[PDB]
Design a binder for this molecule. Structure first.
Ligand SMILES: [Br-]
Ligand SMILES: [Br-]
Ligand SMILES: [Br-]
Ligand SMILES: [Br-]
Ligand SMILES: [Br-]
Ligand SMILES: [Br-]
Ligand SMILES: [Br-]
Ligand SMILES: [Br-]
Ligand SMILES: [Br-]
Ligand SMILES: [Br-]
Ligand SMILES: [Br-]
Ligand SMILES: [Br-]
Ligand SMILES: [Br-]
Ligand SMILES: [Br-]
Ligand SMILES: [Br-]
Ligand SMILES: [Br-]
Ligand SMILES: [Br-]
Ligand SMILES: [Br-]
Ligand SMILES: [Br-]
Ligand SMILES: [Br-]
Ligand SMILES: [Br-]
Ligand SMILES: [Br-]
Length: 300
């Protein structure tokens, strides 16, 4: 049994980024991993001693989930040359990996693109509304992605978006979503938490895309799907590397083309979801894998 510790930036009950690592880690138990998870460690002064403690106790693999945990991972890695570490970040992380650290990245714009593409693939949805949080560069990039994905799959659809200015302000998110609904949105896309948007959607009988998996049953019932990271192949590769003695300096991109970004199991909502939605997304992924389709940089 390989002993694995996951050190998460936020809360694994978020039904989103941190839950994605927790779910991959749960599935990794079938590959012979014994897993411990610690949450809420975005603060590097808190993360570094926890990481050190797992390494000192003889864990085989210590995984820092989220860019905020990356620097502590890289620092402690230098102390334990025979322990294996993982960190996440931007493309520049590849440069900065000690011999015993694997790194990974993904592009926010691609999550947006898949949401928008799914939105444009639906039946009878000509008006789409999206609600995000603060207008930070990665959020604006995500939204530029949505617009592009939607234009690709349905160039006739119209699109409006609203920003709450905040992370995880469900009350403002709900209000923003209701405003788009009142103006005529036939689908609501969440780029932040989504639980507030989900409430507004239920009140107006419209489907959603992107809402947190931690939402209640009534809200989950209207969420067609959500674009997410599948970390399981990456984690499986870590175990294989450790078993073969080849761990270190791998740099993985999780993307649509390689199924690092995928959909959650699709829910049919109303009659807007085509029977072949998954096939359409699979074909999109194949076009990206081949380079038939190339996506712009969605950042300014
Ligand atoms: Br986080
Ligand atoms: Br969850
Ligand atoms: Br994310
Ligand atoms: Br376990
Ligand atoms: Br354990
Ligand atoms: Br433990
Ligand atoms: Br914890
Ligand atoms: Br320390
Ligand atoms: Br983070
Ligand atoms: Br990250
Ligand atoms: Br060591
Ligand atoms: Br991007
Ligand atoms: Br940013
Ligand atoms: Br566009
Ligand atoms: Br707009
Ligand atoms: Br706005
Ligand atoms: Br803002
Ligand atoms: Br709130
Ligand atoms: Br509402
Ligand atoms: Br909820
Ligand atoms: Br190794
Ligand atoms: Br790609």
């Amino acid at each position: 049994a390989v002993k694995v510790a996951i050190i998460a930036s936020g809360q694994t009950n978020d039904g989103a980024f941190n839950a994605w690592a927790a779910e991959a880690a749960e599935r990794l138990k079938a590959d012979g991993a014994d897993v411990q998870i610690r949450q809420g460690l975005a603060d590097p002064t808190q993360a570094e001693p926890v990481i050190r403690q797992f390494a000192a106790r003889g864990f085989d693999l210590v995984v820092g989930h989220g860019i905020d945990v990356s620097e502590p991972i890289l620092r402690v890695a230098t102390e334990f040359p025979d322990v294996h570490f993982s960190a996440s970040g931007d493309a520049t992380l590849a440069e900065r990996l000690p011999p015993n650290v694997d790194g990974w990245t993904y592009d926010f714009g691609q999550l947006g693109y898949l949401d928008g593409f799914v939105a444009g693939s639906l039946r009878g949805v000509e008006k789409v509304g999206a609600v995000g949080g603060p207008q930070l560069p990665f959020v604006l990039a995500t939204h530029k992605g949505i617009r592009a994905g939607l234009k690709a799959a349905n160039p006739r659809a119209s699109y409006e978006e609203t920003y709450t200015g905040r992370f995880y302000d469900l009350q403002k998110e709900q209000e923003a979503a209701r405003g788009l609904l009142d103006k005529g949105a036939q689908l609501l896309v969440a780029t932040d938490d989504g639980r507030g948007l989900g409430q507004a959607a239920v009140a107006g009988d419209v489907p959603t895309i992107g809402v947190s998996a931690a939402a209640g049953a009534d809200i989950k019932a209207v969420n067609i799907t959500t674009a997410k990271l599948d970390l399981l192949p990456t984690y499986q590769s870590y175990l294989e590397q450790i078993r073969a003695g080849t761990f270190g300096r791998r740099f993985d991109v999780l993307a649509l083309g390689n199924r690092g970004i995928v959909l959650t199991p699709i829910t049919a909502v109303g009659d807007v979801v085509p029977d072949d939605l998954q096939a359409r997304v699979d074909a999109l992924s194949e076009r990206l894998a081949s380079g038939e389709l190339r996506l712009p940089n969605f950042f300014e």
